Design a protein around this ligand. Structure first.
Ligand code: HEM
Ligand SMILES: CCCCCCCCCCCCCC(=O)O
Ligand SMILES: *[C@@H]1O[C@H](CO)[C@@H](O)[C@H](O)[C@H]1NC(C)=O
Ligand SMILES: *[C@@H]1O[C@H](CO)[C@@H](O)[C@H](O)[C@H]1NC(C)=O
Ligand SMILES: *[C@@H]1O[C@H](CO)[C@@H](O)[C@H](O)[C@H]1NC(C)=O
Ligand SMILES: *[C@@H]1O[C@H](CO)[C@@H](O)[C@H](O)[C@H]1NC(C)=O
Ligand SMILES: *[C@@H]1O[C@H](CO)[C@@H](O)[C@H](O)[C@H]1NC(C)=O
Ligand SMILES: [Cl-]
Ligand SMILES: [Mg+2]
Length: 325
């Protein structure tokens, strides 16, 4: 389907409404590492079983949270290219499932958003690193660390100052304990953006003060549930304030080299000084390695979704064409 456009009416409004009640999971319902998508599925902005089309995801993040269009397009098509089924146009927001349809040939995995190292990655705030056995479920110990950092740096609330401190701690925790810790290219960028999302989109839009209370935080992160009478943000936004998080503790992209406490900077990795390189490497290396020699129908689907991905890329970058034009 074509990427949806921006909201016609982007005002704050009740999104926990009669048409979108929270419901508990049924057997087979899929939830994954993203509390935003999880909450939209659990309120029926997305299909409640957690399998959706890219267009459904873009409409849901806009309607439910006032996520901005360009950010919605970039993240959705990036996720779908590496984790979704390009022939059926379906993506799981969590585990791999037969519900995304017949699989493409190896080495493509169509693993859902749970797939480690495609979109999902290390030093998540409330989810453990994949090396420790579970990269998708809410983790109470990690959430209690978020509450502690909110008490120490946010007066009890999560805000961008807390984000800056927590983001760093999680990186340092992974360096100290995960011998396979990877923090380069796509993950490097998205990890920082994700820490702003609670302060920008989980805060009731009638306040929009960037101060997230811990009751609301737990509701979204653990139960995929909007607070009672939750109003969405009063304007489209995504990662505004990521500059504050980075400035708190500037880091170079890099990885542990098979041992703990061996963080080695990767000079081939993109960083905030090279955002177009991040896009080019995602397409020429990540997507191309999953689909090195696609058949006619897969090539067409890839090129279509790569065009859609480029719509979400900030002005100034050149489109790359791994399968030609
Ligand atoms: C637009 C499409 C979206 C996609 C494809 C997407 C995908 C993902 C994925 C795969 C992760 C896991 C990364 C990781 O931590 O390892 C993630 C994390 C996250 N997402 Fe989303 N997301 C989207 C939109 C949103 C929205 C609209 C919100 C908030 C309203 C949101 C909030 C978050 C948060 C807070 C995390 C971090 C969880 C943590 O570190 O504990 N996302 N997202
Ligand atoms: C992709 C970095 C995450 C930062 C959080 C804000 C979301 C913006 C989505 C990306 C839009 C432009 C991406 C690009 O120019 O490569
Ligand atoms: C836009 O939405 C607001 C509340 O969310 C509502 O008051 C207003 O009537 C709407 N405008 C249009 C275009 O219907
Ligand atoms: C280890 O890191 C590599 C990339 O460096 C990744 O492909 C692999 O899935 C990682 N394994 C775990 C469980 O972290
Ligand atoms: C949660 O994270 C903690 C701290 O990293 C870890 O020790 C624990 O094994 C994880 N899982 C659960 C189920 O608590
Ligand atoms: C976070 O809240 C605390 C206490 O109110 C404050 O010290 C800090 O400056 C706040 N940060 C932001 C971004 O408002
Ligand atoms: C991506 O591939 C295109 C050719 O399709 C090339 O022009 C560009 O330099 C490549 N970028 C990277 C980072 O490899
Ligand atoms: Cl928008
Ligand atoms: Mg993760």
């Amino acid at each position: 389907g074509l990427p949806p456009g921006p909201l016609e009416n982007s005002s704050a409004k009740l999104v926990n409404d009669e048409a979108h009640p929270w419901k508990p999971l049924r057997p087979g319902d899929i939830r994954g590492p993203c509390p935003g998508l999880n909450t939209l599925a659990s309120h029926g902005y997305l299909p409640r079983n957690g399998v959706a089309t890219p267009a459904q995801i873009i409409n849901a993040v806009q309607e439910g949270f006032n996520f901005d269009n360009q950010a919605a397009i970039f993240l959705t098509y990036a996720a779908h290219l590496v984790d979704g089924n390009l022939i059926t146009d379906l993506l799981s927001i969590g585990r791999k499932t037969r519900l995304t349809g017949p699989d493409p040939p190896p080495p493509a995995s169509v693993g859902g958003l749970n797939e480690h190292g495609t979109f999902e990655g290390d030093a998540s705030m409330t989810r453990g690193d994949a090396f420790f056995g579970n990269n998708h479920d809410f983790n109470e110990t990690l959430f209690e660390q978020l509450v502690d950092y909110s008490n120490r740096f946010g007066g009890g609330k999560y805000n961008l100052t807390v984000a800056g401190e927590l983001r760093f701690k999680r990186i340092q925790d992974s360096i100290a304990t995960n011998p396979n810790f990877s923090f380069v290219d796509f993950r490097f960028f998205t990890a920082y953006g994700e820490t702003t999302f609670p302060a920008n989109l989980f805060v009731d839009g009638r306040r929009d003060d960037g101060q997230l209370d811990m009751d609301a935080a737990r509701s979204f992160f653990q139960f995929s549930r909007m607070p009672d009478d939750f109003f969405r943000a009063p304007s489209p936004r995504s990662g505004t304030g990521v500059e504050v998080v980075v400035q708190a503790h500037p880091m170079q992209p890099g990885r542990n080299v098979g041992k703990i406490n061996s963080y080695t900077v990767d000079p081939t990795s993109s960083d905030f000084s090279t955002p177009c390189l991040m896009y080019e490497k995602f397409v020429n290396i990540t997507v191309k390695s999953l689909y090195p020699n696609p058949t006619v129908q897969l090539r067409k689907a890839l090129n279509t979704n790569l065009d859609f991905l480029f719509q979400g890329v900030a002005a100034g970058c050149t489109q790359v064409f791994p399968y030609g034009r």
